[PDB]
Each structure stands twice: as C-alpha cells, then as structure tokens.
C-alpha cells in the first residue's frame, strides 16, 4: 500500500540527470579557465624574460672608484 517511497526513485533520477549536466558545465568552464591561464603564463614569461635582460643589461658595471 505505502509505495510512496517509489517517488524517491524518480526524485533521484531527476537529480542524477541534473547533477550530471552540472558536471558537464563545470568541466567545460574549468577548461576555459585553464586555457585563459595558459595564455596568461605565456604573457608572464615575456614580462619575466624582459626583466632578466633589463637586469643583465644594467648589472654590468666597471664604473667604480678605488
């Protein structure tokens, strides 16, 4: 008689197919965040190698007084 616990099945299946869709969204937006950071690292090394040359082309000195 009390088969109202069957509604739990359709309630779980509704959430299973729903959370799975959220997994699809989380994984896609996660890749967009990394692809943005991956193109940011390539932008950091250009500003990092520029600091290295600005140091080597400045830390070369023989103008000292004895």
């Amino acid at each position: 008689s009390e088969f109202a616990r069957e509604n739990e099945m359709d309630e779980n299946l509704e959430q299973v197919s729903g959370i799975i869709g959220n997994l699809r969204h989380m994984a896609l937006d996660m890749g967009n965040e990394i692809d943005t950071q991956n193109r940011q690292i390539d932008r950091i090394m250009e500003k990092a190698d520029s600091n290295k040359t600005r140091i080597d082309e400045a830390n070369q000195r023989a103008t000292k007084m004895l």
């Binding site: 739990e8 099945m9 779980n12 299946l13 959430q15 299973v16 959370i19 799975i20 959220n22 997994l23 989380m26 994984a27 996660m30 965040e33 990394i34 943005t36 950071q37 940011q40 690292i41 932008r43 950091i44 500003k47 990092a48 520029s50 600091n51 600005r54 140091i55 400045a58």
Partner: protein, 85 residues
Amino acid sequence: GGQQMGRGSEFMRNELEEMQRRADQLADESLESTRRMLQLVEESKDAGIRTLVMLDEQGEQLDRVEEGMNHINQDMKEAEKNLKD
C-alpha cells in the same frame, strides 16, 4: 497417453518460490541503483567544486605575478634613469 506427474511436485514449488524472490529482487536492485548513482554523482560534484576553488584561487596568484612583474619594471626603470650622473 504419455505419463503422469513425475518429479513435478517439488519442481513446481521451486518455480513458484523463485518467482516470488526474483520478481522482488529486481525491484530492490532498482532502488539500490538510484541510490548508488546518487552517492557517486553527488560526490563527483563536490570534487568539481573543490577543484573550481583551487583553480580560481590560482588565477588570482597569476594576476599577482603579472602585476608583480610590471611593478618590478617600474623600479628597474626608475633605478636606471636615476643612475645617470
């Protein structure tokens, strides 16, 4: 004029007892399936949120480096222009 019932008495009791069990064992597995699917898909959603945190809290670290790289370019150029005479 074939034959009377032979070994049919205990055979019928096996076909009826299993029909009671096999019909309700399928319904019990259908209940365990939805529960097992929840305990796995939900736990994978929690792992995806913890990853979204450490990933988004990493992009702010790369922003501190990039903006930190440009802050050093200022102090390097300010030291070169100041070093003239």
